[PDB]
């Protein structure tokens, strides 16, 4: 998709997780965004569950364990991006 930043931000479902990347030698930043749905599915599968009981997002900030799982999948995504 090719769109203005304001349109992309409006289309982005708030709340969600965002992460910045620096890509040498190009000056700038990448804006990888992970959704509550995928972090939910990842944590559910890692900690043991079937996903038949989804929970809504109530604006609560992600737990430290959730951030750690996010980092775990984030480094894998970045390595796949690089290779």
């Amino acid at each position: 998709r090719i769109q203005p930043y304001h349109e992309f931000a409006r289309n982005l479902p708030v709340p969600t997780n965002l992460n910045l990347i620096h890509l040498k030698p190009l000056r700038g930043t990448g804006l990888v965004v992970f959704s509550p749905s995928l972090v939910f599915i990842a944590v559910d599968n890692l900690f043991g569950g079937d996903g038949r009981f989804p929970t809504k997002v109530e604006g609560r900030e992600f737990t430290h364990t959730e951030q750690r799982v996010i980092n775990r999948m984030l480094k894998l995504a970045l390595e796949g991006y690089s290779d």
């Binding site: 944590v43 890692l46 900690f47 043991g48 009981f53 929970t55 737990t63 750690r68």
Partner: protein, 328 residues
């Protein structure tokens, strides 16, 4: 010859063995043990000659039973296993053993303290990790933790258990480590509900009444919670009769007589039926004969009675568990 604790004796040995000596001692000691040790010497009392002689003689008699010529277990095992089974096998199995010990230590440590602390520690966590941590704890402690969550969260957690599909060990040991680090927060909660109720109880009558009116104006529900936690002095009207008799087995007659002058007539009527018949008749006669008493003295006697009730409840004899609950 002041009695010397194990902390004192350990400090006596540690500041005498040496610098790198104490450091290598802590290399085979847990972090919290190093904490307890470091807390000691910077405020310890200076040692006596016979005190150090006695503690080091105790160290000698313990060293008689403790003589091994041992080498560091982790590095010794690594050096043996790297050639016994290979570097990769040695590393993998050492990490497996370390993770197993980490999760066992976490489970044991978590099944040791008061429930509500761990309950509030895990309240913010994701319900799935809550469920798995809950079930791998001791069943009694698990029940204690579960009896404190809200309806929706507790129901979701048990649904997760009823639909459980298995949990990995390595990430779970990591979760135990993370919640251990979360426990390692230098924070003092000091709930402003129980402490507030106790402070208002220790207040005088006029002060506590004006304070209660102010909190009822600001937020009546908080006032109701505070009074339901503190009960004041008049709660003896809703106190059970057996507990009143248990209290009367210790309260003093003249103090009770002085306090009852300012008490409500219904409270006096309920109270006089609890003690013995001759004691009740004596108390009624004393109330009739005795003239007016200072309200300050009456308040002091009532506060003393309240303090007696509080300590006898701390001992567990008294049952003030939020009223007279339900009769069955």
């Amino acid at each position: 010859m002041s009695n010397l604790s194990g902390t004192d004796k350990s400090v006596i040995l540690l500041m005498t063995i040496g610098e790198d000596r104490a450091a290598e001692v802590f290399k085979h000691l847990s972090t919290r043990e190093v904490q307890a040790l470091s807390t000691a010497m910077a405020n310890v009392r200076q040692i006596s000659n016979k005190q150090l002689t006695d503690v080091l003689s105790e160290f000698e008699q313990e060293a008689e039973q403790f003589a091994a010529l041992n080498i560091n277990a982790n590095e010794y095992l690594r050096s043996v296993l790297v050639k016994a089974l290979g570097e990769e096998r040695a590393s993998s199995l050492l990490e497996d053993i370390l993770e197993t010990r980490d999760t066992t230590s976490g489970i044991e440590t978590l099944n040791f303290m008061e429930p509500q602390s761990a309950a509030d520690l895990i309240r913010d966590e994701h319900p799935q990790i809550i469920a798995t941590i809950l079930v791998h704890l001791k069943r009694s402690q698990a029940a204690d933790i579960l009896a404190l969550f809200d309806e929706r969260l507790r129901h979701d957690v048990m649904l997760r258990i009823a639909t459980f599909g298995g949990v990995q060990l390595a990430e779970l040991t990591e979760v135990l480590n993370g919640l251990l680090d979360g426990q390692n927060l230098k924070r003092s909660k000091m709930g402003g509900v129980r402490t507030a109720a106790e402070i208002i109880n220790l207040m005088k009558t006029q002060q506590e009444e004006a304070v209660i009116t102010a909190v009822r104006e600001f937020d009546g529900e908080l006032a109701q919670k505070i009074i339901d936690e503190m009960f004041l002095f008049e709660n003896l009207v809703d106190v059970d009769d057996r507990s009143i008799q248990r209290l009367l087995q210790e309260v003093d007659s003249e103090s009770l007589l002085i306090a009852l002058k300012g008490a409500e007539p219904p409270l006096r009527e309920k109270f006089l039926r609890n003690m013995s018949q001759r004691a009740a008749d004596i108390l009624r006669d004393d109330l009739a004969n005795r003239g007016p008493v200072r309200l300050s003295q009456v308040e002091n006697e009532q506060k003393a009675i309240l303090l007696i009730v509080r300590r006898l409840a701390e001992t567990g004899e008294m049952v003030i568990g939020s009223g007279e609950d339900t009769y069955v």
